[PDB]
Amino acid sequence: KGIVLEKLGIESKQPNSAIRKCVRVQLIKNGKKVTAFVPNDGCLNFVD
């Protein structure tokens, strides 16, 4: 479990072309910082 720091878009690797939606997270038990993917399209509106 973690806390959301900020919202990001990641450019896909070639040959595919898309800006994929990700977030920066800090883990509660370690303080380590991580990037996570958010599935299912418009679901990014549910996270802040």
Partner 1 sequence: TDDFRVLQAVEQGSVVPTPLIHQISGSQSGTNRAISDLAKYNGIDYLALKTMLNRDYSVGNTIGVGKESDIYRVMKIHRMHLSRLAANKEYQFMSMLYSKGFKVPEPFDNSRHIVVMELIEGYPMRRLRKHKNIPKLYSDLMCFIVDLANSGLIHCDFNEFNIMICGFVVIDFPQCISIQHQDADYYFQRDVDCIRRFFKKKLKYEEGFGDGYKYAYPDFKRDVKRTDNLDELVQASGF
Partner RNA sequence: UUGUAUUGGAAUGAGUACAAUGUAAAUACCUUAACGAGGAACAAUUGGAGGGCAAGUCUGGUGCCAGCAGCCG
Partner RNA sequence: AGGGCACCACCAGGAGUGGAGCCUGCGGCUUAAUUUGGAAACUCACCAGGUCCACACAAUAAGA
Of RNA, partner 1, none, which one does residue 14 interact with (CB within 5 to 8 Å by kind)?
partner 1
Question: Which runs of consecutive H residues, i.e. helices, occur in 1-48?
Answer: none
Of RNA, partner 1, none, which one does residue 4 interact with (CB within 5 to 8 Å by kind)?
none
Greatest Cα-to-Cα distance within the chain, rounded to the nearest angstrom: 38
Q: Which is nearer to partner 1, 19 or 28 (CB)?
A: 19
Residue 21 binds RNA (CB under 7 A): yes
Give the per-residue contact string, 9-28, with partner 1 (x = CB under 8 A; - = no).
--x--xx-x-x---------
**14 phi/psi in degrees, rounded to 5:** -60, 145
Contact between 25 and 32 under an 8 Å Cβ cutoff? The reply is no
